[PDB]
């Protein structure tokens, strides 16, 4: 309690209480001060099929995560086995479509990452609270069978999708291609107050295994690919999707080289 | 300063100071509380020839108010007399173009309105500061000579333009045509503080003779006419839809009134 | 009988009778002289549902007179009552469509005018014959119930339509809008001759209640409205007809003002 | 002047003088009777290098008559001999372009026709005035050397052009191609009157050797070919449809005639 | 046998036999020398309804020869009688469509020509072999009944079609129109060798009745007509075919003249 | 010269000399036999800065071979070192642009290939002439520093370009991308004759280290990528499809190889 800065604050409040057109009591002024202090501090502070899979070409398959629900992990692993069965053999390449993914259940994201990782860190949260610092490590099981995969990210890829993509990139397990990410990582917790009300505050932030903050740096793809049209000068979705076709061709070339 | 609720405010502030991700000192929190208390209360709170006239048709004339400057009143009356000289007789109809008018000198606004009014109120402000209340009533002289007029108002007509239009409508002196108005009918005074700083606060707001606040209600035209361009298959009504509509209304009103 | 001018005429006739390629007798030359004297004097001299009504909008109705037949008057009055019944109340505005109206029975036109007029003159014919001068006055009954109406006139509006429009305008009962009128008013009578034949001659002309000749001045609308297209910069026939939409909007504005 | 029918005429004139709306004196009525007697009888009654030639193909040549001037005959014969020199031998076919030819000097027309005729009539006029009859017969010399020719006639070919074309057709000397002709085959003489004025009257009209009047029948081509433009996927037949048709007809006629 | 030139040849052959990359024996070198000697000498040397007829307009008929098969002659004569029966009278004009005709049986071509010819030569082959010189004369029977005909030839008109067209043109029996001909006339005979193989050689060439070689000069139409579109400035196939329409109009004009 | 088959050849030649339409002497037949024996055997038989480099992205560089001149080797090594200096460190990927390369100095080709190879064969020629066999093996120095590279080949890449590309592919040193190559892998020597004339004969042909003939097989790229243009919605990969594909393949290969 500074008291002198509180004097300045109360003086401004009294001037407002005196001059404003419509009369205002002390309580509404205090509440507006609180709401604005939170608004000025942090914008987030206050006071259905998940997975679709398909074998797009012989040897090369496509797995899209529309959203991160609770069942999402089991569904991605189910789809992995299903794609292995559809190709009637081991897969030559996989495309993770994580674009247009707002986020969702963090644990489901970590288990989706666990389908591709056998060791190492996945994501960790850092803040100044005791119960904020949280680490997540990969289990020694990956239903992916080390399949080479390229992950697609758009601007509308945020939160859990961004966590998954950053984990897969920092582990050098996947090729990230597409445009940059929404760059938002935060964990708002609701804190209780002695008054009969509570306040929501960002208490910590997500960090990828390397250590880059998702909130600030975002996730930068290893290959930048904007939407574009190719003109030759000589179901099947890649005939209409430029980014998916590019990912498919990159996987094909990687398989040929290897 | 009621210390009992000050306990609640300081406790909320301390909880925020404790929980936020990146540390923030007391000074920035208090400053943001001030800025938000002003911001949450009021969006306005913080811490060229004026008139051009023309006779559109024999008997029907057009008077445009680009802006409200000091010369505006004198120029409006000069233009009124000049238009009476142009038609070589009394006018059958007049159009006040108050569209695209941000406002200007309030006294010039009351002078423009007073050119059309012989009695009654023009505008009055209401607020809680000592010397804010100012009323404006019409003097018993109108250079308009009781000509029937249509006033055109769009969205980009605010402040003094809205005072003039609202006075003309509530006094049942003119017919308002066009779309709705901006609705900026508030006055902001700069108040000084014991600290070497000041705050802008709305201290009063404008009211039309009826009693309707311009700040909220704005001024709603009697006939809604959106902007459009007419193409026949100088004379501005041949190109301006709203002006053509007002002119035709005045002509029909004159014919019926025989 | 000038005799000397007849000498000149007979001399020219004899020269023609002598020199022309194919021989011509005196009779055909005389007949051609007559036909040309009439042709040179006056071009008019020689020798099916009528009414459709509809309530276009709540309060505002539309009455078109395709042509002036004998039943036309009773049909317009029938339609007046029918439109009053359709609106389930008194009418706010009416549009008389008299454009594309060649004319027809004069008495039917005068009775159509009588549906809107309670007193005063309607039309009068003037000529130099005893039985040519004819006056027509309004009866004290108007099924219109003083409804404000706008009358539409095109270039193809002539004869009885022009009489109706001129009567309604000079009585200051209707608003005439659209383009100018065919400007034709005449009354050709057939006159008998001692020879077994007759000649048709314009014997008199129509005059509106004011006294303007319809044949020369035509009928000038109070508001000139050519065909045009409006472009917004933000059954139901007026959505396709520009003149009808303009008349509707003028009636709406007049109702709002009144 | 048969006074008995003059009674009928004067009585009709007096009835008209009595009945017409605006009064008219006897003089204007008599003058209009004169003007109409002439007008109703006859529409014509009231009160640059000439030739260009070219050899289109080896053996086939083209001769155009822009107008009929005095030099026209000499120039046509000069062009005939010159075209024989151009082909270095007798011609297989010739095209007379008489299209877009208003007419001109009649004697030049008979000279142009006489360049193709060795015997028979060319043109003769019939009328009822003393010295009108003029006949034109061919002399036993033709510089054309009996070359088969097609003559082209359009609507804008009148008077002397039609005389030439009709002579060539009725003498079975040429094949006419194109559309129909104007049909202006009448001569107007100015006749003087005892009054200081005169009248234009058609005094005779032209007749082709067959006996058909040019004024009414015109000249109808043996082959109807409308105007058109051909575009291949100088040589004017490559651009002119009618000329190309005439040229191809001449070529085929030459091949068959072997 | 020059022996010295054979020495030069054998010396070049031995140099080739020694230096070439892949080893080659004497036999393949000799065979390649033979094949190239023939290739360098002459490109041709080495080592289904036929007829469709229709009466296109009253009096004017169309006969197309798709190809020259054995039955072709009887079929053209059958079609001649059929067209005479269809028109219900003698024919005014006929169009032979020989364009897009590769050729075929020579005898069938000569009999097709015999349907239009009553005397004279048709085609004769000239070469330096005893049994090569061959003449073909017309029989005194023509089922055409002397009908005037125009023959159409394109660039893709060769061999027997070209023979027919040349015969009809040189006899001055038909009008050839269209573009030039493939210009190919040859008769390759297979000659036997003492070795168990044979060689095909052009042994003679075709000549039209005039004597022009078909192989070199080709067949030049009397009227050149490329594909084009006509634009008026005022089943039935000729409405779509320019060349056929031109041939039809030429036949019509020829009939009118005759 | 085996006279027994010479009998067959001379007999065939005499039969041709006898049967052909136009007479031909023995000399022209023998000359054509020579020209065809060479022509039927072999189509080739009868009787500017070289390198430009650029670093496309941090770590990834581009080296283009316009042509194979003498300076080419020195310039390629200079550019390699310069690109290492440009990236300020070892390169992650390199692109050899061998497209649109006709060939050039063979020794420069072996020098360009030797800049990437440390051991093994580069190219060897096989033929039947005494001094044709020339082999080229790599020296144990490679200025490339084992950088992974993709080589681009199109159809217009022949001769030395194909030698370089084939060496790089068969040594499993580079990944070939693009379309197939020209396939011109043959050497022509001019051989002199006892007559004052000479013959061009292919004396040997090129072979890649695997043993595949370049003349027939050409060089088939490991990844087929046709030419195309990309348009985003200097940096040449932003405009070149094949180069962009190679760059993205190199980037993905680098990420996987971590």
Numbering used by the authors:
A (entry chain B), C (entry chain B), E (entry chain B): 41 to 87, 191 to 377, 411 to 434
B (entry chain A), D (entry chain A), F (entry chain A): 41 to 87, 191 to 376, 411 to 435
From the primary publication:
Pseudomonas aeruginosa CtpA is a carboxyl-terminal processing protease that partners with the outer membrane lipoprotein LbcA to degrade at least five cell wall-associated proteins, four of which are cell wall hydrolases. Instead, it requires the adaptor protein LbcA, the lipoprotein-binding partner of CtpA, for activity in vivo and in vitro. Therefore, it appears that LbcA interacts with CtpA to assemble an active proteolytic complex, which controls the activity of these enzymes by degrading them. We show that CtpA alone assembles as an inactive trimer of dimers and that LbcA is a right-handed spiral that might wrap around a substrate protein.
